[PDB]
Amino acid sequence: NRSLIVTTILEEPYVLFKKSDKPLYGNDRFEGYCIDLLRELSTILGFTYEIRLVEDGKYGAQDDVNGQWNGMVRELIDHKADLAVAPLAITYVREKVIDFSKPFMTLGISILYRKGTPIDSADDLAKQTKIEYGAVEDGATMTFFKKSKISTYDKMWAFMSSRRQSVLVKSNEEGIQRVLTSDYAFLMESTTIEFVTQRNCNLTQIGGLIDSKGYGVGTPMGSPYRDKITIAILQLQEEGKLHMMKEKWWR
Amino acid sequence: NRSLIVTTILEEPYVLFKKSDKPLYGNDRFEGYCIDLLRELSTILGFTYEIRLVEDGKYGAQDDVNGQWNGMVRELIDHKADLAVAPLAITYVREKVIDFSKPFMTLGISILYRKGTPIDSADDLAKQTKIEYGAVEDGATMTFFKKSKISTYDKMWAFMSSRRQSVLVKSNEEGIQRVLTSDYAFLMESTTIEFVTQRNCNLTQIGGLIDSKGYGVGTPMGSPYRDKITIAILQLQEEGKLHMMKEKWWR
Ligand SMILES: N[C@@H](CCC(=O)O)C(=O)O
Numbered sequence A, B: 001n002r003s004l005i006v007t008t009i010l011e012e013p014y015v016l017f018k019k020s021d022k023p024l025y026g027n028d029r030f031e032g033y034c035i036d037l038l039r040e041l042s043t044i045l046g047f048t049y050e051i052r053l054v055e056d057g058k059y060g061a062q063d064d065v066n067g068q069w070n071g072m073v074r075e076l077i078d079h080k081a082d083l084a085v086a087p088l089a090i091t092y093v094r095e096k097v098i099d100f101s102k103p104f105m106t107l108g109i110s111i112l113y114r115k116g117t118p119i120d121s122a123d124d125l126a127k128q129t130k131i132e133y134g135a136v137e138d139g140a141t142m143t144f145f146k147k148s149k150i151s152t153y154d155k156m157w158a159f160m161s162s163r164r165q166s167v168l169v170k171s172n173e174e175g176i177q178r179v180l181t182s183d184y185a186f187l188m189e190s191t192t193i194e195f196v197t198q199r200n201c202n203l204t205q206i207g208g209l210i211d212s213k214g215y216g217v218g219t220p221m222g223s224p225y226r227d228k229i230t231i232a233i234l235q236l237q238e239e240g241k242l243h244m245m246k247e248k249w250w251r
């Protein structure tokens, strides 16, 4: 049984490079919530693996022109990876091209901004054009706005799209920095906002959740590993290990 | 200027009877997040007040037979109170009969159950008839299910409705006890689940948020106080006082 190739993406505290004085090798080079999850999956299901960072640095979205996918989603479609273990949102459009396990974490889209301001909701941001706002390019949040039919979200996308290169960023980290250095509000996932606000007393979530979704392990469509992984995840959930993992990495 | 009559309801940690070795009088007889909020409103807007407990002990729903409202909603409609300061959900159906200030807290409907079970979502509950589940009678959660057109929620309401007397309860506290003593799952608001799971290590939230809403101060339709209260709440939110109040009562 050859090792499985697992694609992922850098994103604290799910996946990060492990720091050490002595040279690190193999799977020990990475750490995080998803790295701990992957380890548990491997021993419960009996497989060895190698971690690969998604080459184009993206989560995954479909191209308007050629309709092709990119990111981790595309790597799965082309069989360049056996699994995708990262904070990968389970979405209807993605389910048309790849398979997902049951979710290992639930969350929703929300807003990150500085505290001490009069902005209290997405409506407050959408009714003005002075304060800029955006999201991670080629990710699930950007896609949510791009496909939304809800007036407020639809005009917010018209805004983002018209200033795409200035307001859509390559990573959550870039988005956080943009919030701390300019009149900018960032649309990101609640679980990540929780982590961020706990470490930056000047930041806060604005309003509640704009939607509801979950993170799941991705596999190429038809993979025999998808149902096995769901079994492993449910077991970890039931015994309280996923809760323990969240507490460990979020604190 | 006569003092305002403020209706509310017993619900920890928003409203509870204050304990003391010595006799308590007037507004000092109560305490909680909503009691602190009410005090702040009174000094910012300049009014005196008296706290009243909703007489029929309900939040508010429309009667299936005669369409009449009950609970705090009805006390506002009948002008038995000037304001309703409690964890009162801002809903479309309620907005048709009373007015609400902007939200002072955001939340969503979710599931409370024992940990260590294979139940992981509302779907896991809806696909079986053994484990019973319910909600607070005449509250926003019940109304959400009664009016939902979403298949899963629609079949869950059919279930609750068909066993109404056995599964709907008079209070969140009754629901919590039902969960701790029988094979029962309880549909309640996330902010309350947060408080409960923090004090009962054997309980946990199941799945994510089923919907998104907020709590606001209610007033009789057309009341000149509604816009004034919104101004007060936004001020408290911006200065971080609402955040401080949440941390104080949830810990
Ligand atoms: N977690 C998202 C990326 C970040 C975001 O869209 O907020 C995804 O799976 O695409």
Ligand SMILES: N[C@@H](CCC(=O)O)C(=O)O
Binding pocket: B059, B060, B087, B088, B089, B135, B136, B138, B139, B140, B141, B142, B187, B188, B189
């Ligand atoms: N907060 C709810 C009551 C509790 C519930 O419905 O879960 C209301 O305002 O009706």
